Amino acid sequence: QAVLKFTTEIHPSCVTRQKVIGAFGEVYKGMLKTKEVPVAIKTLKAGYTEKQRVDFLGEAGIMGQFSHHNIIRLEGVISKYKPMMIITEYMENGALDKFLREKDGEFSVLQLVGMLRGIAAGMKYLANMNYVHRDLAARNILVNSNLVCKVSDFGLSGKIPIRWTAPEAISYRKFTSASDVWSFGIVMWEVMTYGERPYWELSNHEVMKAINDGFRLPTPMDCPSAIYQLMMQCWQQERARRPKFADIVSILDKLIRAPDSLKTLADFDPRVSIRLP
Ligand SMILES: Cc1ccc(C(=O)Nc2cccc(C(F)(F)F)c2)cc1Nc1nc(N2CCC[C@H](O)C2)nc(-n2ccnc2)n1
């Protein structure tokens, strides 16, 4: 029970499950009695294995431990009754990838960079807490009604997220906070492009080959030079050369606080010629 030391135990009478939103069990949208609050509810259904129980309660325990503005907030856990449940806050705006694609061009550069600073602060916290995310991507980030981004982990889409993953993590399963930094660079590109697919139609093998050949994603349109410089350094082949999350947070904070620094734009390489008088 020590695993749950940072969690609040919720009584089942306070929870109502309404609609399945994911699927040892299912995830539901529901309501929590604490005037009810909307919540997401992950269940561990009858028949779960020992490994599944250890993973489920371990997930609940770390989510309770995390207490940060940019990490999804655990409302509580049901561990004393069956089915067991993990209950989190709910965001009507949903996941960041779909959000940006449905709001193309609607935000200022400063708003976009602010979302990256928040994601970076959440990741710095996770790394400092010695938690390696392994699946950092815009699809795993929730957006609240204040445009605050909350790092989450919804599990795999299981689709292996090759184009978000650092080379050493793909090649030999070395997942660390430095491979999370690589993923963060990809998230920066996702944000600045309003959710474009990294590497467009390239297949997974083509992406890995391009990376090994030295190619990197080109600059997004209208992107601050400093922001593209930062994402590029997240994609250094040599793990030890990448910035740490503390460096990323510091840089993003300083750019936002001296906002003229974001007015210098990186050149964009057009794919298409339009000749006009
Ligand atoms: C119930 C639930 C359980 C666990 C997690 C979760 O993050 N665990 C996690 C594990 C390790 C590390 C971290 C860490 F470090 F990142 F924090 C976080 C999130 C949700 N809650 C949730 N799950 C979904 N799902 C899940 C099924 C697929 C579906 O498409 C979306 N959707 C919403 N949701 C949507 C709109 N508002 C809220 N909430």
mmCIF file of C-alpha atoms and ligand atoms in Angstrom:
data_model
loop_
_atom_site.group_PDB
_atom_site.id
_atom_site.type_symbol
_atom_site.label_atom_id
_atom_site.label_comp_id
_atom_site.label_asym_id
_atom_site.label_seq_id
_atom_site.Cartn_x
_atom_site.Cartn_y
_atom_site.Cartn_z
ATOM 1 C CA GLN A 1 0.000 0.000 0.000
ATOM 2 C CA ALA A 2 3.065 2.234 0.298
ATOM 3 C CA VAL A 3 3.032 2.522 -3.521
ATOM 4 C CA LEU A 4 -0.109 4.668 -3.162
ATOM 5 C CA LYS A 5 1.364 6.977 -0.492
ATOM 6 C CA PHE A 6 0.800 10.142 -2.586
ATOM 7 C CA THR A 7 -2.700 9.223 -3.825
ATOM 8 C CA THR A 8 -6.173 9.931 -2.504
ATOM 9 C CA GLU A 9 -8.459 6.911 -2.258
ATOM 10 C CA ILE A 10 -11.826 7.631 -3.888
ATOM 11 C CA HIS A 11 -14.948 5.746 -2.904
ATOM 12 C CA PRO A 12 -16.740 4.020 -5.823
ATOM 13 C CA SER A 13 -20.051 5.687 -4.927
ATOM 14 C CA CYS A 14 -18.509 8.989 -6.069
ATOM 15 C CA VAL A 15 -17.724 7.811 -9.623
ATOM 16 C CA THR A 16 -20.054 7.378 -12.602
ATOM 17 C CA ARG A 17 -18.716 6.025 -15.895
ATOM 18 C CA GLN A 18 -20.473 7.344 -18.986
ATOM 19 C CA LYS A 19 -18.766 6.605 -22.326
ATOM 20 C CA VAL A 20 -15.839 4.442 -23.399
ATOM 21 C CA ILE A 21 -12.912 6.536 -24.655
ATOM 22 C CA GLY A 22 -10.134 3.906 -24.697
ATOM 23 C CA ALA A 23 -9.413 0.211 -24.295
ATOM 24 C CA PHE A 24 -6.505 -4.785 -18.735
ATOM 25 C CA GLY A 25 -9.765 -2.791 -18.958
ATOM 26 C CA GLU A 26 -11.287 0.286 -20.524
ATOM 27 C CA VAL A 27 -10.982 4.043 -20.154
ATOM 28 C CA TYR A 28 -14.158 6.065 -19.680
ATOM 29 C CA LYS A 29 -15.283 9.616 -19.666
ATOM 30 C CA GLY A 30 -17.300 10.087 -16.464
ATOM 31 C CA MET A 31 -18.174 12.277 -13.496
ATOM 32 C CA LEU A 32 -16.717 12.544 -9.996
ATOM 33 C CA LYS A 33 -18.625 13.693 -6.871
ATOM 34 C CA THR A 34 -16.218 15.646 -4.627
ATOM 35 C CA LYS A 35 -21.097 20.317 -8.850
ATOM 36 C CA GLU A 36 -19.720 17.024 -10.164
ATOM 37 C CA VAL A 37 -16.388 17.185 -11.978
ATOM 38 C CA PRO A 38 -15.740 15.637 -15.418
ATOM 39 C CA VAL A 39 -13.050 12.958 -15.225
ATOM 40 C CA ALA A 40 -11.327 10.256 -17.227
ATOM 41 C CA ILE A 41 -11.437 6.826 -15.596
ATOM 42 C CA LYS A 42 -9.086 3.920 -16.371
ATOM 43 C CA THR A 43 -10.287 0.571 -15.039
ATOM 44 C CA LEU A 44 -8.498 -2.669 -14.214
ATOM 45 C CA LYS A 45 -11.102 -5.327 -15.009
ATOM 46 C CA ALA A 46 -11.652 -8.744 -13.455
ATOM 47 C CA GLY A 47 -9.044 -11.294 -14.499
ATOM 48 C CA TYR A 48 -6.032 -8.986 -14.512
ATOM 49 C CA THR A 49 -2.640 -10.603 -14.019
ATOM 50 C CA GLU A 50 -0.113 -9.951 -11.265
ATOM 51 C CA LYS A 51 2.079 -7.988 -13.695
ATOM 52 C CA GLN A 52 -0.943 -5.913 -14.747
ATOM 53 C CA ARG A 53 -1.769 -5.142 -11.107
ATOM 54 C CA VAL A 54 1.824 -4.096 -10.353
ATOM 55 C CA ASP A 55 1.878 -1.855 -13.431
ATOM 56 C CA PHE A 56 -1.575 -0.397 -12.704
ATOM 57 C CA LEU A 57 -0.924 0.467 -9.062
ATOM 58 C CA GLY A 58 2.563 1.652 -9.991
ATOM 59 C CA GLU A 59 1.043 4.018 -12.544
ATOM 60 C CA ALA A 60 -1.453 5.274 -9.971
ATOM 61 C CA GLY A 61 1.341 5.740 -7.448
ATOM 62 C CA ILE A 62 3.624 7.795 -9.683
ATOM 63 C CA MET A 63 0.724 9.911 -10.943
ATOM 64 C CA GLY A 64 -0.141 10.741 -7.343
ATOM 65 C CA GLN A 65 3.506 11.575 -6.656
ATOM 66 C CA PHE A 66 3.679 14.016 -9.547
ATOM 67 C CA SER A 67 2.383 17.446 -8.569
ATOM 68 C CA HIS A 68 3.136 19.945 -11.312
ATOM 69 C CA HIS A 69 1.312 22.568 -13.375
ATOM 70 C CA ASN A 70 2.273 20.786 -16.616
ATOM 71 C CA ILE A 71 1.541 17.148 -15.638
ATOM 72 C CA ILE A 72 -1.956 15.636 -15.804
ATOM 73 C CA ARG A 73 -3.607 15.798 -12.355
ATOM 74 C CA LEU A 74 -4.640 12.534 -10.662
ATOM 75 C CA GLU A 75 -7.920 13.028 -8.826
ATOM 76 C CA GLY A 76 -7.484 9.723 -7.040
ATOM 77 C CA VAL A 77 -7.524 5.952 -7.142
ATOM 78 C CA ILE A 78 -9.917 3.140 -6.330
ATOM 79 C CA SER A 79 -7.735 0.322 -5.010
ATOM 80 C CA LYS A 80 -9.864 -1.150 -2.209
ATOM 81 C CA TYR A 81 -12.744 -2.257 -4.466
ATOM 82 C CA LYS A 82 -13.118 -3.985 -7.828
ATOM 83 C CA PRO A 83 -12.758 -2.873 -10.518
ATOM 84 C CA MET A 84 -9.778 -0.769 -9.542
ATOM 85 C CA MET A 85 -9.629 2.681 -11.129
ATOM 86 C CA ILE A 86 -7.285 5.568 -11.910
ATOM 87 C CA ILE A 87 -9.198 8.847 -12.112
ATOM 88 C CA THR A 88 -7.779 12.004 -13.718
ATOM 89 C CA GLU A 89 -8.946 15.466 -14.656
ATOM 90 C CA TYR A 90 -10.652 15.948 -18.022
ATOM 91 C CA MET A 91 -9.993 18.629 -20.665
ATOM 92 C CA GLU A 92 -12.723 19.584 -23.131
ATOM 93 C CA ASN A 93 -10.040 20.851 -25.535
ATOM 94 C CA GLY A 94 -8.537 17.348 -25.627
ATOM 95 C CA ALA A 95 -5.177 16.283 -26.966
ATOM 96 C CA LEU A 96 -2.734 18.820 -28.367
ATOM 97 C CA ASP A 97 -2.184 17.191 -31.781
ATOM 98 C CA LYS A 98 -5.860 17.180 -32.768
ATOM 99 C CA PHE A 99 -6.348 20.578 -31.085
ATOM 100 C CA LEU A 100 -3.709 22.292 -33.197
ATOM 101 C CA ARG A 101 -4.869 20.679 -36.441
ATOM 102 C CA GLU A 102 -8.382 22.001 -35.774
ATOM 103 C CA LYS A 103 -7.095 25.506 -34.910
ATOM 104 C CA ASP A 104 -4.583 25.994 -37.719
ATOM 105 C CA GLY A 105 -3.034 29.459 -37.670
ATOM 106 C CA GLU A 106 -5.170 30.687 -34.744
ATOM 107 C CA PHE A 107 -2.424 31.481 -32.204
ATOM 108 C CA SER A 108 0.427 33.915 -31.857
ATOM 109 C CA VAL A 109 4.054 32.853 -31.870
ATOM 110 C CA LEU A 110 4.211 33.798 -28.195
ATOM 111 C CA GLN A 111 1.235 31.535 -27.410
ATOM 112 C CA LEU A 112 2.852 28.615 -29.256
ATOM 113 C CA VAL A 113 6.216 29.126 -27.544
ATOM 114 C CA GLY A 114 4.434 29.401 -24.205
ATOM 115 C CA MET A 115 2.910 25.973 -24.751
ATOM 116 C CA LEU A 116 6.409 24.607 -25.409
ATOM 117 C CA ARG A 117 7.781 26.184 -22.237
ATOM 118 C CA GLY A 118 5.025 24.482 -20.257
ATOM 119 C CA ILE A 119 5.653 21.079 -21.839
ATOM 120 C CA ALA A 120 9.379 21.527 -21.188
ATOM 121 C CA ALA A 121 8.745 22.395 -17.528
ATOM 122 C CA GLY A 122 6.649 19.271 -17.105
ATOM 123 C CA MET A 123 9.373 17.183 -18.740
ATOM 124 C CA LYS A 124 12.108 18.762 -16.612
ATOM 125 C CA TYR A 125 10.073 17.763 -13.566
ATOM 126 C CA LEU A 126 9.628 14.174 -14.788
ATOM 127 C CA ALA A 127 13.313 13.802 -15.637
ATOM 128 C CA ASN A 128 14.349 15.241 -12.249
ATOM 129 C CA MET A 129 11.962 12.809 -10.543
ATOM 130 C CA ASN A 130 13.846 10.060 -12.465
ATOM 131 C CA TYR A 131 10.869 9.193 -14.663
ATOM 132 C CA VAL A 132 11.525 8.475 -18.343
ATOM 133 C CA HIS A 133 8.398 9.082 -20.394
ATOM 134 C CA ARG A 134 9.275 7.041 -23.548
ATOM 135 C CA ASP A 135 6.236 8.253 -25.543
ATOM 136 C CA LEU A 136 6.410 12.036 -25.609
ATOM 137 C CA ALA A 137 4.326 13.292 -28.558
ATOM 138 C CA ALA A 138 1.624 15.914 -29.007
ATOM 139 C CA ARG A 139 -0.998 13.132 -28.866
ATOM 140 C CA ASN A 140 0.012 12.557 -25.218
ATOM 141 C CA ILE A 141 -0.403 16.204 -24.137
ATOM 142 C CA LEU A 142 -3.715 17.655 -22.939
ATOM 143 C CA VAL A 143 -4.664 21.323 -23.326
ATOM 144 C CA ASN A 144 -6.746 23.071 -20.672
ATOM 145 C CA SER A 145 -8.974 26.133 -21.098
ATOM 146 C CA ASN A 146 -6.018 28.357 -20.158
ATOM 147 C CA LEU A 147 -3.914 26.885 -23.023
ATOM 148 C CA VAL A 148 -1.824 25.104 -20.366
ATOM 149 C CA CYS A 149 -0.315 21.876 -21.657
ATOM 150 C CA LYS A 150 -0.332 18.821 -19.374
ATOM 151 C CA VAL A 151 1.989 15.936 -20.157
ATOM 152 C CA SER A 152 0.101 12.627 -20.000
ATOM 153 C CA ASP A 153 0.607 9.065 -21.238
ATOM 154 C CA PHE A 154 -2.346 7.435 -22.947
ATOM 155 C CA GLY A 155 -0.393 4.339 -23.968
ATOM 156 C CA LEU A 156 0.518 3.598 -27.547
ATOM 157 C CA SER A 157 -1.945 4.635 -30.257
ATOM 158 C CA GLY A 158 0.210 -0.707 -30.129
ATOM 159 C CA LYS A 159 1.780 1.604 -32.699
ATOM 160 C CA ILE A 160 5.512 2.129 -32.070
ATOM 161 C CA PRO A 161 6.217 5.892 -32.400
ATOM 162 C CA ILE A 162 9.372 5.603 -34.493
ATOM 163 C CA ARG A 163 9.376 9.174 -35.799
ATOM 164 C CA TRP A 164 9.254 10.567 -32.236
ATOM 165 C CA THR A 165 11.945 8.259 -30.853
ATOM 166 C CA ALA A 166 15.678 8.903 -30.489
ATOM 167 C CA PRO A 167 18.048 6.653 -32.462
ATOM 168 C CA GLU A 168 19.542 4.951 -29.396
ATOM 169 C CA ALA A 169 16.091 4.115 -28.069
ATOM 170 C CA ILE A 170 15.087 2.528 -31.379
ATOM 171 C CA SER A 171 18.397 0.757 -31.948
ATOM 172 C CA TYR A 172 19.125 -0.723 -28.519
ATOM 173 C CA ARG A 173 16.202 0.185 -26.231
ATOM 174 C CA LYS A 174 18.125 2.933 -24.390
ATOM 175 C CA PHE A 175 15.276 5.126 -23.132
ATOM 176 C CA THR A 176 16.456 8.005 -20.934
ATOM 177 C CA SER A 177 15.611 11.626 -20.339
ATOM 178 C CA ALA A 178 17.946 12.369 -23.265
ATOM 179 C CA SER A 179 15.801 10.298 -25.611
ATOM 180 C CA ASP A 180 12.828 12.205 -24.196
ATOM 181 C CA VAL A 181 14.688 15.381 -25.256
ATOM 182 C CA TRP A 182 14.759 14.089 -28.844
ATOM 183 C CA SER A 183 11.009 13.504 -28.642
ATOM 184 C CA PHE A 184 10.550 17.005 -27.199
ATOM 185 C CA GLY A 185 12.259 18.432 -30.283
ATOM 186 C CA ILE A 186 9.724 16.594 -32.440
ATOM 187 C CA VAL A 187 6.924 17.999 -30.252
ATOM 188 C CA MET A 188 8.362 21.486 -30.809
ATOM 189 C CA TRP A 189 8.065 20.892 -34.550
ATOM 190 C CA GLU A 190 4.508 19.550 -34.149
ATOM 191 C CA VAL A 191 3.491 22.675 -32.212
ATOM 192 C CA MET A 192 5.107 25.165 -34.579
ATOM 193 C CA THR A 193 3.486 23.471 -37.630
ATOM 194 C CA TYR A 194 0.014 23.181 -36.036
ATOM 195 C CA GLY A 195 0.219 19.408 -35.898
ATOM 196 C CA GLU A 196 1.828 18.430 -39.165
ATOM 197 C CA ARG A 197 2.885 14.810 -39.401
ATOM 198 C CA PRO A 198 6.639 14.611 -38.703
ATOM 199 C CA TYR A 199 8.432 13.671 -41.949
ATOM 200 C CA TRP A 200 5.092 13.739 -43.861
ATOM 201 C CA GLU A 201 4.560 10.554 -45.895
ATOM 202 C CA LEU A 202 7.987 9.015 -45.258
ATOM 203 C CA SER A 203 7.685 5.480 -43.920
ATOM 204 C CA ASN A 204 9.215 4.502 -40.593
ATOM 205 C CA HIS A 205 12.208 2.896 -42.314
ATOM 206 C CA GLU A 206 12.659 5.961 -44.540
ATOM 207 C CA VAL A 207 12.639 8.230 -41.472
ATOM 208 C CA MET A 208 15.315 6.193 -39.713
ATOM 209 C CA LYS A 209 17.408 6.100 -42.897
ATOM 210 C CA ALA A 210 17.070 9.871 -43.344
ATOM 211 C CA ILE A 211 18.119 10.483 -39.733
ATOM 212 C CA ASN A 212 21.126 8.185 -40.102
ATOM 213 C CA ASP A 213 22.072 9.902 -43.378
ATOM 214 C CA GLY A 214 22.154 13.241 -41.483
ATOM 215 C CA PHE A 215 18.875 14.791 -42.636
ATOM 216 C CA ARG A 216 16.649 16.623 -40.158
ATOM 217 C CA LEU A 217 13.174 18.119 -40.314
ATOM 218 C CA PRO A 218 13.213 21.530 -42.059
ATOM 219 C CA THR A 219 12.027 24.674 -40.394
ATOM 220 C CA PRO A 220 8.286 25.226 -40.028
ATOM 221 C CA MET A 221 6.796 28.245 -41.754
ATOM 222 C CA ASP A 222 7.001 31.534 -39.830
ATOM 223 C CA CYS A 223 9.189 29.956 -37.114
ATOM 224 C CA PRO A 224 11.477 31.963 -34.812
ATOM 225 C CA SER A 225 15.138 31.289 -35.542
ATOM 226 C CA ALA A 226 15.851 30.588 -31.868
ATOM 227 C CA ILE A 227 13.091 27.973 -31.714
ATOM 228 C CA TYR A 228 14.361 26.078 -34.745
ATOM 229 C CA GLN A 229 17.919 26.245 -33.392
ATOM 230 C CA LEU A 230 16.684 24.703 -30.146
ATOM 231 C CA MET A 231 14.734 21.874 -31.761
ATOM 232 C CA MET A 232 17.726 21.067 -33.993
ATOM 233 C CA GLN A 233 19.962 20.614 -30.946
ATOM 234 C CA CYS A 234 17.442 18.162 -29.474
ATOM 235 C CA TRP A 235 18.109 16.012 -32.568
ATOM 236 C CA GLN A 236 21.849 15.543 -32.144
ATOM 237 C CA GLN A 237 22.820 11.952 -32.863
ATOM 238 C CA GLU A 238 25.179 11.882 -29.873
ATOM 239 C CA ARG A 239 22.997 11.612 -26.761
ATOM 240 C CA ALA A 240 25.451 13.478 -24.539
ATOM 241 C CA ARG A 241 25.433 16.547 -26.799
ATOM 242 C CA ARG A 242 21.687 17.204 -26.488
ATOM 243 C CA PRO A 243 20.505 19.903 -24.069
ATOM 244 C CA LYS A 244 19.110 18.737 -20.767
ATOM 245 C CA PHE A 245 15.541 19.704 -19.939
ATOM 246 C CA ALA A 246 16.902 22.341 -17.554
ATOM 247 C CA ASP A 247 18.647 23.984 -20.517
ATOM 248 C CA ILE A 248 15.489 23.798 -22.627
ATOM 249 C CA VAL A 249 13.283 25.343 -19.928
ATOM 250 C CA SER A 250 15.807 28.113 -19.280
ATOM 251 C CA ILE A 251 16.111 29.025 -22.961
ATOM 252 C CA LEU A 252 12.353 29.016 -23.600
ATOM 253 C CA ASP A 253 11.726 31.108 -20.474
ATOM 254 C CA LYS A 254 14.353 33.675 -21.495
ATOM 255 C CA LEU A 255 12.986 33.909 -25.042
ATOM 256 C CA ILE A 256 9.452 34.503 -23.763
ATOM 257 C CA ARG A 257 10.653 37.056 -21.219
ATOM 258 C CA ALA A 258 12.581 38.988 -23.912
ATOM 259 C CA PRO A 259 9.935 38.534 -26.615
ATOM 260 C CA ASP A 260 11.701 40.555 -29.313
ATOM 261 C CA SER A 261 14.074 37.571 -29.432
ATOM 262 C CA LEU A 262 11.293 35.619 -31.197
ATOM 263 C CA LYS A 263 10.836 38.211 -34.002
ATOM 264 C CA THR A 264 13.880 36.968 -35.941
ATOM 265 C CA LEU A 265 12.516 34.239 -38.219
ATOM 266 C CA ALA A 266 14.294 31.269 -39.731
ATOM 267 C CA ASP A 267 14.266 31.131 -43.531
ATOM 268 C CA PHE A 268 11.665 28.708 -44.902
ATOM 269 C CA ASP A 269 12.549 26.527 -47.900
ATOM 270 C CA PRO A 270 9.621 26.576 -50.358
ATOM 271 C CA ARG A 271 8.701 23.321 -52.043
ATOM 272 C CA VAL A 272 6.736 25.109 -54.753
ATOM 273 C CA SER A 273 7.496 27.978 -57.129
ATOM 274 C CA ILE A 274 4.916 30.654 -57.891
ATOM 275 C CA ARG A 275 6.108 33.202 -60.454
ATOM 276 C CA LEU A 276 4.093 36.433 -60.640
ATOM 277 C CA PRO A 277 4.840 40.033 -61.736
HETATM 278 C C1 LIG B 1 -7.521 7.883 -17.036
HETATM 279 C C2 LIG B 1 -6.135 8.105 -17.224
HETATM 280 C C3 LIG B 1 -5.179 7.223 -16.704
HETATM 281 C C4 LIG B 1 -3.804 7.462 -16.875
HETATM 282 C C5 LIG B 1 -3.331 8.563 -17.596
HETATM 283 C C6 LIG B 1 -1.965 8.902 -17.758
HETATM 284 O O1 LIG B 1 -1.682 9.967 -18.312
HETATM 285 N N1 LIG B 1 -1.037 8.095 -17.139
HETATM 286 C C7 LIG B 1 0.313 8.356 -17.079
HETATM 287 C C8 LIG B 1 1.186 7.275 -16.943
HETATM 288 C C9 LIG B 1 2.564 7.474 -16.841
HETATM 289 C C10 LIG B 1 3.099 8.758 -16.848
HETATM 290 C C11 LIG B 1 2.258 9.866 -16.961
HETATM 291 C C12 LIG B 1 2.802 11.169 -16.997
HETATM 292 F F1 LIG B 1 4.047 11.190 -16.536
HETATM 293 F F2 LIG B 1 2.838 11.620 -18.240
HETATM 294 F F3 LIG B 1 2.091 11.991 -16.273
HETATM 295 C C13 LIG B 1 0.873 9.652 -17.064
HETATM 296 C C14 LIG B 1 -4.297 9.438 -18.100
HETATM 297 C C15 LIG B 1 -5.668 9.206 -17.949
HETATM 298 N N2 LIG B 1 -6.593 10.097 -18.386
HETATM 299 C C16 LIG B 1 -7.001 10.276 -19.637
HETATM 300 N N3 LIG B 1 -6.908 9.333 -20.571
HETATM 301 C C17 LIG B 1 -7.366 9.606 -21.799
HETATM 302 N N4 LIG B 1 -7.244 8.694 -22.760
HETATM 303 C C18 LIG B 1 -6.776 7.331 -22.436
HETATM 304 C C19 LIG B 1 -7.326 6.298 -23.384
HETATM 305 C C20 LIG B 1 -7.123 6.754 -24.821
HETATM 306 C C21 LIG B 1 -7.944 8.005 -25.038
HETATM 307 O O2 LIG B 1 -7.859 8.410 -26.418
HETATM 308 C C22 LIG B 1 -7.429 9.121 -24.161
HETATM 309 N N5 LIG B 1 -7.918 10.794 -22.100
HETATM 310 C C23 LIG B 1 -8.022 11.724 -21.150
HETATM 311 N N6 LIG B 1 -8.569 12.912 -21.409
HETATM 312 C C24 LIG B 1 -9.103 13.313 -22.564
HETATM 313 C C25 LIG B 1 -9.539 14.561 -22.379
HETATM 314 N N7 LIG B 1 -9.287 14.919 -21.116
HETATM 315 C C26 LIG B 1 -8.684 13.895 -20.517
HETATM 316 N N8 LIG B 1 -7.573 11.457 -19.924
#
